[PDB]
Amino acid sequence: MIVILDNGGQYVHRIHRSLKYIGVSSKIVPNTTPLEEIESNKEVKGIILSGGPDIEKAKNCIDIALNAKLPILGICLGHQLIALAYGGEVGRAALTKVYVDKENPLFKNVPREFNAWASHKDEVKKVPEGFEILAHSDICQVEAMKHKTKPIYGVQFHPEVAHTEYGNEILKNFCKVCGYKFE
Ligand SMILES: [Zn+2]
Ligand SMILES: [Zn+2]
Ligand SMILES: [Zn+2]
Ligand SMILES: [Zn+2]
Ligand SMILES: [Zn+2]
Ligand SMILES: [Zn+2]
Numbered sequence: 001m002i003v004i005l006d007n008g009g010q011y012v013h014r015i016h017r018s019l020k021y022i023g024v025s026s027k028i029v030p031n032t033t034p035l036e037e038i039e040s041n042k043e044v045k046g047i048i049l050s051g052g053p054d055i056e057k058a059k060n061c062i063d064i065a066l067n068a069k070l071p072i073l074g075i076c077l078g079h080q081l082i083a084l085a086y087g088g089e090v091g092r093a094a095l096t097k098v099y100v101d102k103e104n105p106l107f108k109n110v111p112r113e114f115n116a117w118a119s120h121k122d123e124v125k126k127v128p129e130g131f132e133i134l135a136h137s138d139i140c141q142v143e144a145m146k147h148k149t150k151p152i153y154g155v156q157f158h159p160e161v162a163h164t165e166y167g168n169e170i171l172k173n174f175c176k177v178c179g180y181k182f183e
Contacts, residue, residue, distance in 0.1 A: 001024075001025045001026065001027060001041070001043045001044050001045065002019055002024055002025070002026040002027075002044070002045065002046050002047070002048060002175065002178065003026070003027055003029055003033075003038050003044050003046070003047050003048070004016060004026050004027070004028050004029070004047075004048040004050055005029060005030075005031040005033065005047065005048065005049050005050055005058075005060075005061060005064065005078070006028050006029065006030055006031055006050055006052075007031050007049060007050040007051060007052030007057075007058040007061065007077050007078060007081075008031075008050075008052035008053055008054060008057055008058070009050045009051035009052045009053070009075075009076070009077070011050075011051060011158055011160050011161055012028055012050045012051070012052075013028070014158075014160040014161060015048055015050060015075070015160040015171075016028055017160075018159070018160045018167065018168050018171050019171060019175070021168060022168055022171065022172045022175065022182075023182070024171075024172075024175050024180060026048075031049075031050075031057075031058050031060050031061055032060050033060075035063065035064050035067050035068060038064075038068075038070070039068070039069060039070060044070060045070065045071075045175075045178035045179055045180065046070050046071045046072070046073070046174065046175070046177070046178035047064060047068055047070050047071070047072050047073075048072075048073050048074075048075065048078065048174075049061045049064070049065070049072065049073070049074040049075065049077070049078025049079075049081055049082065050075060050077070050078055051075050051076035051077050051078065051118075051158060052076075052077045052078075053077075055077055055080060055081065055084075055122070058077060058078075058081055059081070061074075061078060061081040061082075061085070062081060062084065062085045063085075065081060065082045065085035065086070065152065066085050066086070068152075070151075070178070071151035071152070071153070071174065071177045071178050072151070072152045072153065073153045073154070073155070073171075073174045074152075074153070074154035074155070075154075075155055075157075075158055075159070075160070076118055076120055076155075076156060076157070076158055077122075078154065079124060079144075079145070079154030079155055079156055080122055080123075080124060080154075082128075082145075082152060082154045083124040083126075083127065083128060083131075083142075083145070083154065085128075086128030086129070086130065086131065086147070087128050087129060088124060088126055088127050088128035088129075088131065089124070089125045089126035090122060090123070090124055090125060091122070091123065091125040092121065092122060092123075093120055093121050093122060093123045093140070094117055094118065094119045094163075095115050095116075095117060095163065096115070096116050096117075096118070096137045096140075096143065096157065097113060097114075097115060097137060097138065098113070098114055098115070098116045098135050098136070098137055098143045098144075098157065099112070099113060099135060099136055099137065099143075100112050100113070100114075100134065100135045101133060101134060101135060101136065102132065102133075102134045102135075102146075104134045104146055105146075105153070105173050105174070105176065105177045106134060106135075106144060106146070106153055106155070106170055106173050106174065107134065107135065107144075107166075107170065107173070108173055108176075109166075109169050109173070110166040110169055110170065110173075111165075111166070114165040114166050115163075115164070115165045116143065116155075116156075116157030116158075116159075116164045116165065116167075117157055117158055117161045117163035117164045118156055118157040118158050120156060123140055123142065123156055124142040124145065124154070124156065125141075125142070127142055127145050128147075130147055130148055130149070131145050131146065131147050131148065131152075132145065132146055132148050133145055134146055135155075140156070142156065143155065143156050143157065144156065144157075151177050153174060153177070155170065159171050
């Protein structure tokens with residue numbers, strides 16, 4: 001099972017439907033849910049930090065990003081909250097051409113280029129120390145990132161919206177990082 005923290009986004013339920021599509025169970029919990037409550041259920045293989053409109057209503061994701069033993073994927077706001085947590089810089093900014101520099105876990109079975117959706121207004125300007133950039137666009141330097149040694153992933157785009165090319169494959173890939181096999 002995957003736990004999804006509700007950061008208020010209008011597409012949070014779409015993450016739960018996308019996971020079910022690829023055969024993965026998920027539960028939408030409040031973003032005030034403590035880590036010790038998520039990590040005590042032995043069937044949780046991973047945490048997703050959802051998108052949302054207000055980063056001030058989602059700062060519990062900070063501690064989760066720093067303390068989780070489980071793998072973490074941040075989407076949009078969740079991606080930003082990961083950057084803030086580890087001391088990276090976040091600043092002011094829909095269909096974007098995304099260039100994959102490191103096929104890493106996240107972009108295996110995805111083309112080197114693809115179109116990704118997000119109307120964000122805030123982006124990651126500098127990746128935290130001990131992170132690396134996996135993907136960028138023409139203008140913006142960080143479209144997706146990972147900690148170099150921890151299973152912590154962020155994507156500025158929403159892979160749970162149809163408008164995003166290969167979005168279910170990117171979610172499937174994070175599930176592979178969470179120890180899911182498929183065949
Ligand atoms: Zn359901
Ligand atoms: Zn968003
Ligand atoms: Zn590049
Ligand atoms: Zn963008
Ligand atoms: Zn941007
Ligand atoms: Zn930019």
